[PDB]
Amino acid sequence: KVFGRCELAAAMKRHGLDNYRGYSLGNWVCAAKFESNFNTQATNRNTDGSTDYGILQINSRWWCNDGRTPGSRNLCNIPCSALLSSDITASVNCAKKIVSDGNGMNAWVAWRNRCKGTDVQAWIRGCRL
Ligand SMILES: [Cl-]
Ligand SMILES: [Cl-]
Numbered sequence: 001k002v003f004g005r006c007e008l009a010a011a012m013k014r015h016g017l018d019n020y021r022g023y024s025l026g027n028w029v030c031a032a033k034f035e036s037n038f039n040t041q042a043t044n045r046n047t048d049g050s051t052d053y054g055i056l057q058i059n060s061r062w063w064c065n066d067g068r069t070p071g072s073r074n075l076c077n078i079p080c081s082a083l084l085s086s087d088i089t090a091s092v093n094c095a096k097k098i099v100s101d102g103n104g105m106n107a108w109v110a111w112r113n114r115c116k117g118t119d120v121q122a123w124i125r126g127c128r129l
Contacts (some may be wrong), residue, residue: 001086003038003055005029006127008088013129015092021099025129026120027111028095032056033123034110040091041084054083054091056098056108063094 003011009029012018018025035057036042044052050061050069060069064080076094083091098107105111 001040003032003040005033005038005123006129008032008038008055009124009127010129011088012092015089017092017095018129020096021104023099023105024120026123027105027115028056029123030115030118030120031105031108031111034114035108040086040088043084051080053080055088056091056095057110058083058091058094058098063098 009025012028013025017028032038032055036055038055040055042054042057044057046052046059048061050059051066052059053064053066058064058076058080060066060072060080062073063076064078064083065072065074066080076097078090078094083094099105101107105116
């Protein structure tokens with residue numbers, strides 16, 4: 001599913017991501033834009049043999065099981081395919097764990113490089129939330 005911008009904002013808010021660990025909703029929308037283009041089906045192989053999955057490009061080394069990443073820890077206790085669903089629940093729950101890991105949203109490279117320090121509220125402008 002490719003979410004609309006405000007559609008994704010509303011889903012993320014309903015799931016309790018807005019202000020989660022101090023990250024306002026626009027941070028999450030911005031991260032999802034650059035990680036996945038709001039596409040739940042997005043996948044990308046990493047150099048180390050792991051793969052990133054879903055709207056927030058969650059990695060198969062630490063977080064989910066994809067059956068092909070040796071040494072995977074599956075800390076979210078989910079198949080990586082669950083992160084591709086049109087229902088973002090599993091991605092949100094796992095993102096909450098990731099953002100609580102110690103480095104906040106710096107866990108998302110695209111957030112660090114393209115969202116952090118910018119006017120992230122722009123990402124939710126116009127939306128009815
Ligand atoms: Cl915001
Ligand atoms: Cl933080």
